[PDB]
């Protein structure tokens, strides 16, 4: 909905869901990232704030992007679609490349990757003491935002596990294997384990726990397919 608003409206701390997301691994120190949609546009640098507040929760929002450098005027390295998935306490970025340059003026490649995961990291020492929570959300990749993500965390056991379902290619409807909850370098609570496909190991996944009462998880999964590595975006929440 409010795509063009997100590009123009300044930060307002009374919007819904996660209200801003700092672009760290979406824009490096050298580049500028131009995003456009609905005839509006905005250029972000490294560490600038993107206003995710102006957007719908639990949906993927699509911008066209250009990743430039000013060596003269612009030099656009990459183009394609820039996707944000917003939840209440966390959010992800993603890049669906469509064009990359050559030494020849622009080639045509398709690559999909995760960019930034951010939000209110649940501190490891303020997790719920006991109980078990069930999270539900989406699993989305290149040309697919219809995946279903289920996950369960037993806090006193310090264990999480779940599954990705209903994606268009079968090789990614995967189990997210039992993994423990560990503290971060910033003492945030993180889970990182193995991806399993019909009882066999096929890469890794990572999940941060978000929100004051651990309402959400968010992170990524790398899955091996008959055609190589494929990145999945993961965001779920509680009942």
């Amino acid at each position, epitope marked *: 909905a409010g795509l063009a608003d997100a590009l123009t409206a300044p930060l307002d701390h009374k919007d819904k869901g996660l209200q801003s997301l700092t672009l760290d691994q979406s824009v490096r120190k050298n580049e500028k990232l131009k995003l456009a949609a609905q005839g509006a546009e905005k250029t972000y640098g490294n560490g600038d704030s993107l206003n995710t507040g102006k957007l719908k929760n639990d949906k993927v929002s699509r911008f066209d992007f250009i990743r430039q450098i000013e060596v003269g005027q612009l030099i656009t390295l990459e183009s394609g679609e820039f996707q944000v998935y917003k939840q209440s306490h966390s959010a992800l970025t993603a890049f669906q490349t469509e064009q990359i340059q050559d030494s020849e003026k622009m080639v045509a490649k398709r690559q999909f990757r995760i960019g930034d995961i951010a939000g209110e990291h649940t501190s490891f020492d303020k997790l719920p*003491e006991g109980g078990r929570a069930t999270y539900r959300g989406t699993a989305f990749g290149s040309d697919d935002a219809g995946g279903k993500l289920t996950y369960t965390i037993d806090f006193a056991a*310090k*264990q999480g596990n779940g599954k990705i379902e209903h994606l268009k290619s079968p090789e990614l409807n995967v189990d997210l294997a039992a993994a423990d909850i560990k503290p971060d370098g910033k003492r945030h609570a993180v889970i990182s*384990g193995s991806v399993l496909y019909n009882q066999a190991e096929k890469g890794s996944y990572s999940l941060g726990i978000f929100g004051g009462k651990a309402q959400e998880v968010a992170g990524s999964a790398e899955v091996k397919t008959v055609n190589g590595i494929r990145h999945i975006g993961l965001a779920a929440k509680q009942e």
Partner: antibody
Framework: QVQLVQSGGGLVKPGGSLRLSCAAS????????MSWIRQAPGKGLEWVSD????????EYADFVKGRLTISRDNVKNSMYLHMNSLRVEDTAVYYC?????????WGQGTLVTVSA | EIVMTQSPGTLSLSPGETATLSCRAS???????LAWYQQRRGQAPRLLIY???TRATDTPDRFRGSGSGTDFILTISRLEPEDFAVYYC?????????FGQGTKLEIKR
């Protein structure tokens, strides 16, 4: 450097009392559930007790019946089992361990013998 | 209300052989809450596997947990001398976190 170091224990006569202690090192003690498991001489493991992070919620196996109570000290980073009314059936090696159920770190164990 | 029965009670094999240990639950159970522990002579138990198939952080590749419903297997391939020990399974889904009676793995010569 993640460590659980135990102390206490010994021999007591039936109906006597003991204390086990369990000193934690190398991990954020307050974040975790903590448990005691026992092994009778020549047998298998049996969960005894566990306690939540805050130190007030306490589960006991059906053989305990208020004779053993669990407590924790989140600034000295320690855990205790208070043992009263001991029976010869309580003879065993008692281990402290981290987490509820999924015991991913264990102390070295201490010997409690109950005999007349 | 739940009993875990391990078989066989004892077992002999040479180093380099492959061990196959059974953990049978009296009712169907959730595999994310199945654990295997290793207890060597005179030492504390050690978490080896949790979630029926995840290796604890220092369990080497040659241990593999598996199974579902009521059966779980620990397959120890290419037995090294440090692997001869007692092995216990456990269902930690809730109290009393029942352990099995164990299986003793000894050296065949």
């Amino acid at each position: 450097q993640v460590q659980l170091v135990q102390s206490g224990g010994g021999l007591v006569k039936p109906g006597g009392s003991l204390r086990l202690s369990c000193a934690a090192s190398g991990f954020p003690f307050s974040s975790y559930y903590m448990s005691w498991i026992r092994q009778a001489p020549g047998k298998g493991l049996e969960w005894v007790s566990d306690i939540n992070n805050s130190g007030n919620v306490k589960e006991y196996a059906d053989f305990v019946k208020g004779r053993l109570t669990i407590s924790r000290d989140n600034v000295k980073n320690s855990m205790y089992l208070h043992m009263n009314s001991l029976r010869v059936e309580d003879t065993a090696v008692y281990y402290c361990a981290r987490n509820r159920g999924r015991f991913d770190v264990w102390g070295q164990g201490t010997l409690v013998t109950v005999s007349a | 209300e739940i009993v875990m029965t391990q078989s066989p009670g004892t077992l002999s094999l040479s180093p380099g052989e492959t061990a196959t240990l059974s953990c049978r639950a009296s009712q169907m159970i959730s595999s994310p809450f199945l654990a295997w522990y290793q207890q060597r002579r005179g030492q504390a138990p050690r978490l080896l596997i949790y979630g029926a198939s995840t290796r604890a952080t220092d369990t080497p590749d040659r241990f593999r947990g598996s199974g579902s419903g009521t059966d779980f297997i620990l397959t120890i391939s290419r037995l090294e001398p440090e692997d001869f020990a007692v092995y216990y399974c456990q269902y930690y889904d809730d109290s009393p976190f029942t352990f099995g009676q164990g299986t003793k793995l000894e050296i065949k010569r």
